[PDB]
Amino acid sequence: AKLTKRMRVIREKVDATKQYDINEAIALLKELATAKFVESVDVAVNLGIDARKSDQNVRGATVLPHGTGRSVRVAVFTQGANAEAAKAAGAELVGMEDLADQIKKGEMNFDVVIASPDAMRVVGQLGQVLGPRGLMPNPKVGTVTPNVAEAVKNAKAGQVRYRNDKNGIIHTTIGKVDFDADKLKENLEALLVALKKAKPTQAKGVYIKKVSISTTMGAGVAV
Amino acid sequence: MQVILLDKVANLGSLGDQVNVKAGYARNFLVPQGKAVPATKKNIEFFEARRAELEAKLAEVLAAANARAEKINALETVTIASKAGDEGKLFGSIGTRDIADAVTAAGVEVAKSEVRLPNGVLRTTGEHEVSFQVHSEVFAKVIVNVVAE
Amino acid sequence: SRVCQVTGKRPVTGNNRSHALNATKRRFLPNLHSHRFWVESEKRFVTLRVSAKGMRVIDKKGIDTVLAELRARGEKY
Amino acid sequence: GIREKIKLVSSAGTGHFYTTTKNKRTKPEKLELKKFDPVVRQHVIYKEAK
RNA sequence: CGCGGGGUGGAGCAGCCUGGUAGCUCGUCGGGCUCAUAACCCGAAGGUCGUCGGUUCAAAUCCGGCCCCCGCAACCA
RNA sequence: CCAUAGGUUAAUGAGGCGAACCGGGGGAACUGAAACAUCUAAGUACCCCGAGGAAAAGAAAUCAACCGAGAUUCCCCCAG
RNA sequence: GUUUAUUAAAAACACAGCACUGUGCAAACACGAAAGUGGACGUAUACGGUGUGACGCCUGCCCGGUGCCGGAAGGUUAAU
RNA sequence: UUGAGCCUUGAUGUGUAGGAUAGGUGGGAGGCUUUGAAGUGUGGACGCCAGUCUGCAUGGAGCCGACCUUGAAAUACCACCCUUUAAUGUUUGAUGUUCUAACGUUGACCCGUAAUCCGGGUUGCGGACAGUGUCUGGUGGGUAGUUUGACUGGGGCGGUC
RNA sequence: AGCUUGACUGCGAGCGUGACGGCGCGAGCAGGUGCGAAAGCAGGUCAUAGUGAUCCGGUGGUUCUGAAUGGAAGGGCCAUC
């Protein structure tokens, strides 16, 4: 090193080897920020469980007080009066066959798409344009249900979605560095207990190999 | 290895100074000979006292053991013939008093079996290690000198 | 006797055991090698056979304390 | 023992498992078989053999 | 009592990370070639890439199980 | 040289014969387990060695249990 | 020539010559709680050891299976 | 001199098609360059010939998506994750050289002693090689103890418990 | 063919058998669910072969035990390989 001036002035506040206690650093997390974009604190977990076998692949989503670090714009594909119930619960766009032409042609202004089972006949024709975005609803993960009003509300309330990468590693954001550091020790447990309930059916003995926590292009914190 | 010095090893450091040395070089030489101690301030005055009770067996011969050096040790330059030529090379010597005498123009008698040669026998006019006992484990250097042809 | 000449630690018998379970007497012999020392009293140097823990008494008390009690047990060094 | 025995828990998961002679080696089928939970002394649905 | 690989016209093997896609050598039925016979070369004919689950618009292929094969394998009283 | 290897002899002590017991050092196998192999035979048998009227052992870094006993040994039990 | 004492006296064993694999000298080889001594007061034209079998003139094929030497390309892989 | 390992540094991605070397994967519109590219030429270099890096004449804040089109799918501006390897720094080994405050001498000489045993004494030569013992894995009849079921109108092929 | 899981839990008078270990069959009671409109019926298969006593340690509950005693290790029960 060789290091950029934006971070060289933050090493004027922090040690290069110490990982700081999240119960003691509660005034320091807001103080190491330097970027022209919003910096975060993200959790890095090592697995496992088998590093190759896809039967032990981990997937899911967990609800948090700040979700992904922002609110989401939710769209709902539903016919008749059940669509007005989702519009009053958390949807900002109601979808129908007239909207399935626009999504296929290329234009979409929403973070999450939910559908009801008799409306899912239309959305089934969008599976290849919604696929590479992770935007496609699927009954086998609950993103298709008759109670669409509760399903749009589950997304609007703020949730984070995950799956493990190659050789068994998984990374997820748990707050902005400017957000209340007092709650990091509380929200980390709500993330961990939910990820621990997501253990595979054929998992045996162990599940976590190592846990680490760091800031965007910045220092690590200790638990 | 952090140690404190107890001897005149001025090429390694000063007396009573704290220096870093290798653990093997300490264990094989500086520790067993009474020249250095591990740098633990509360345990060194004891290791010094342990050396004083072993000094009390020859302290009187560090004071007086040479009739010609009664209060302080002397350095002397040789006065006996170097038994060489202009090439500075010779067959050497076999006589245990044929060398190292520094008062040759005088009625002073050279000591029997008290000479010590730390590097080997003098086979050249070159400057080399040469000493005479005052006691069985206590020695004084003398400076080799080119004399006669 | 092949001993550490300052402590008198000697070869002896017992049971060593095989790689698995079974008895083996085999005769025991402690590790031993030569080392040179100044003695003061003979005004010369000597070679003596010394080993484990016995060389450590010389480490704890010095060569003037340990070697001065030798040459009484019919000692041939 | 060439039978690879399975053990399921009740609807409520409480107490011990129910060990069963139901096979998994030869055919993929429904594992629910409705059995007795002695904490309630009632016939209930049984779940998850892992 | 375990693990790795394999199941493909008549025999023995591909593979992977171009998922929109059955390749091959050897034989057989026929030519090139040849005075034939050898050496080399390439047309033609014939098969559910086993089997039960799974993801999907889609798998012989990948992901889970089974079974028969081909190579390696270990222990308490 | 100092010293040490080495050489005398003054005084004392040892040495050899021992009857069993006693302590120390070495140390099996046949046999037993109805196999044989950890285990057993056994620290027996025997070889090597010293000493008393006997020898061993001894004056708690013991043994207990919130209560205490107060160096060691010999016998009857605890307990097959 | 040697020979199986009292049931085969030899086609058995032995010296010759040939081949090969080791061995630079404190050799390789050998007996030993390990010195030491034998190899040898020898020096690869010497010595160890296993074959075959004096002499004359000669000695075809197979390295897949067994052992041995170097590697472990590729597999399986201990201790700590 | 280098084996393995850890940090630092720098770049990995072209099945295939064109404008095009779509890494994975999740975000995202104003963000980045003032020895800095543009663009046609005399040059250097890797190349999958597309692209990129450097130099000079120069000109000097662009440029880009969205627009426009290509495709299931995007293409400014960015976390997070991962390759193969050298040097700067360094953890731990190996081979070789050299010095010798550990240890060897099948080196000599002197004294015991006009003693081709041996110690001591003096001086040369070797040297962390060797040597001797020790523990764990491997190997290993050279040596020591032991095992190797029963029926079968006998043995043996076959039958059998 | 419809519904369905009695391929039941805890107890059991006993009945048949071999020298014994051990093997085979079980009225019926209690708990609960299932079929049938109901009287009534279900502890598998049309019956008989389809499998190793124990010592060991592992696995999941309990709080019976647990060397000074409050925890713990280890064992016992309960549930199993």
Side-chain angles (χ1 to χ4, degrees):
Chain A
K2 291 180 174 187
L3 71 167
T4 59
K5 190 161 62 176
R6 67 176 188 182
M7 188 267 281
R8 206 163 63 228
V9 302
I10 304 300
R11 300 298 183 82
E12 238 74 295
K13 304 191 185 191
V14 78
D15 187 273
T17 320
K18 183 173 172 92
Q19 294 177 52
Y20 298 78
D21 173 31
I22 65 169
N23 183 251
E24 188 172 42
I26 59 162
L28 186 64
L29 185 64
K30 69 188 176 168
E31 199 62 32
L32 302 179
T34 201
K36 299 181 70 171
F37 47 66
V38 287
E39 285 161 275
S40 70
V41 56
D42 288 37
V43 184
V45 184
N46 290 89
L47 304 180
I49 77 167
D50 197 290
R52 183 262 293 184
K53 291 177 178 178
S54 299
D55 188 64
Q56 299 175 38
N57 181 253
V58 181
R59 308 195 181 180
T62 301
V63 182
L64 292 175
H66 52 61
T68 53
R70 67 168 180 93
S71 199
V72 287
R73 193 174 189 251
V74 190
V76 68
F77 278 80
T78 297
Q79 59 177 354
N82 199 25
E84 289 292 331
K87 175 173 176 185
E92 216 171 276
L93 184 67
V94 179
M96 66 292 298
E97 194 176 278
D98 186 81
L99 187 63
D101 181 61
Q102 299 290 81
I103 296 172
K104 194 178 184 289
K105 285 170 173 165
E107 65 200 273
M108 59 199 81
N109 191 1
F110 31 85
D111 291 299
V112 175
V113 179
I114 302 299
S116 71
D118 56 288
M120 194 62 185
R121 288 177 290 177
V122 185
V123 183
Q125 301 193 341
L126 307 176
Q128 302 160 8
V129 297
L130 297 177
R133 294 176 170 110
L135 191 57
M136 185 61 176
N138 173 13
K140 301 174 187 176
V141 304
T143 55
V144 181
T145 184
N147 70 324
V148 289
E150 292 186 79
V152 299
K153 189 175 178 183
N154 168 248
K156 191 68 181 184
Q159 61 176 354
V160 68
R161 183 172 62 184
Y162 49 80
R163 72 180 196 253
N164 80 254
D165 191 32
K166 296 173 294 295
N167 197 249
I169 64 178
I170 195 170
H171 294 65
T172 306
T173 198
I174 195 49
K176 303 305 184 207
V177 303
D178 209 278
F179 188 81
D180 199 31
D182 186 77
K183 308 303 182 291
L184 182 58
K185 195 177 174 70
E186 184 177 281
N187 294 338
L188 179 64
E189 193 180 306
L191 190 79
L192 287 172
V193 75
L195 181 61
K196 285 170 60 259
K197 283 187 181 184
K199 276 190 301 286
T201 303
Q202 300 204 95
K204 293 177 56 66
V206 289
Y207 181 50
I208 294 178
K209 189 185 175 185
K210 199 176 188 170
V211 184
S212 307
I213 312 180
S214 293
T215 51
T216 298
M217 299 180 291
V221 298
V223 293
Chain B
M1 211 295 188
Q2 296 291 4
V3 301
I4 296 168
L5 298 177
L6 213 74
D7 189 35
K8 62 165 181 172
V9 291
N11 67 284
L12 303 179
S14 307
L15 184 66
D17 199 358
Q18 200 283 278
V19 297
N20 194 337
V21 302
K22 295 184 72 193
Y25 187 67
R27 187 174 176 259
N28 195 359
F29 171 55
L30 299 170
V31 168
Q33 290 284 4
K35 300 186 183 301
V37 65
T40 2
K41 295 187 178 190
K42 308 178 204 183
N43 301 112
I44 64 180
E45 191 163 76
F46 172 73
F47 184 84
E48 184 184 63
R50 276 194 67 231
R51 203 189 73 179
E53 59 174 77
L54 179 63
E55 186 180 290
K57 298 191 180 192
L58 57 59
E60 284 282 308
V61 292
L62 289 171
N66 176 9
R68 306 178 53 246
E70 191 175 293
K71 289 288 194 166
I72 181 161
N73 184 69
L75 182 64
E76 303 198 86
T77 305
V78 167
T79 53
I80 187 61
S82 41
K83 292 187 170 180
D86 63 88
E87 196 181 68
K89 295 191 181 295
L90 66 153
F91 188 83
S93 61
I94 198 170
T96 43
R97 299 195 292 158
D98 193 40
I99 58 171
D101 180 38
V103 286
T104 309
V108 184
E109 283 279 85
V110 181
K112 298 183 298 297
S113 263
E114 284 189 66
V115 71
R116 168 61 181 148
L117 297 179
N119 289 358
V121 172
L122 304 176
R123 298 174 179 108
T124 61
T125 52
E127 190 184 83
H128 291 291
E129 302 307 291
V130 182
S131 61
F132 256 115
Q133 286 182 2
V134 302
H135 170 73
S136 310
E137 66 184 277
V138 183
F139 303 88
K141 171 168 279 194
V142 295
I143 307 302
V144 288
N145 193 22
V146 182
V147 181
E149 190 183 56
Chain C
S1 193
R2 279 188 288 185
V3 305
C4 185
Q5 301 187 257
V6 291
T7 56
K9 175 174 60 176
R10 64 186 297 259
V12 288
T13 68
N15 186 353
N16 183 98
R17 303 282 173 170
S18 287
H19 187 325
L21 188 62
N22 293 8
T24 46
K25 177 165 282 186
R26 86 166 189 76
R27 195 239 192 185
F28 299 125
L29 178 61
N31 92 96
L32 188 64
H33 13 76
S34 297
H35 219 231
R36 278 71 65 94
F37 300 102
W38 177 252
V39 294
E40 135 284 349
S41 72
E42 308 197 58
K43 296 178 176 294
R44 74 188 179 86
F45 294 87
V46 302
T47 184
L48 195 75
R49 301 198 295 196
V50 290
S51 77
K53 185 166 273 175
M55 196 66 198
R56 229 172 195 120
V57 192
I58 305 175
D59 201 76
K60 191 169 185 184
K61 305 190 179 185
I63 53 173
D64 166 75
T65 307
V66 184
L67 307 181
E69 290 178 32
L70 303 181
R71 204 87 78 192
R73 290 75 56 99
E75 295 164 270
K76 318 299 285 187
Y77 64 87
Chain D
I2 76 166
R3 291 185 178 281
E4 292 88 75
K5 284 78 66 191
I6 66 179
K7 287 164 181 59
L8 286 79
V9 297
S10 77
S11 53
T14 23
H16 57 76
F17 52 72
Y18 193 112
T19 202
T20 175
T21 57
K22 188 170 183 64
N23 194 9
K24 204 187 191 300
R25 180 183 272 231
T26 57
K27 179 175 165 216
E29 64 164 270
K30 189 176 189 189
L31 301 181
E32 211 304 285
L33 82 183
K34 189 218 69 184
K35 299 292 162 186
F36 194 78
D37 183 350
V39 186
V40 293
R41 299 191 181 287
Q42 183 182 103
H43 295 76
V44 298
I45 64 180
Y46 268 71
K47 69 189 187 184
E48 197 64 75
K50 308 194 81 176

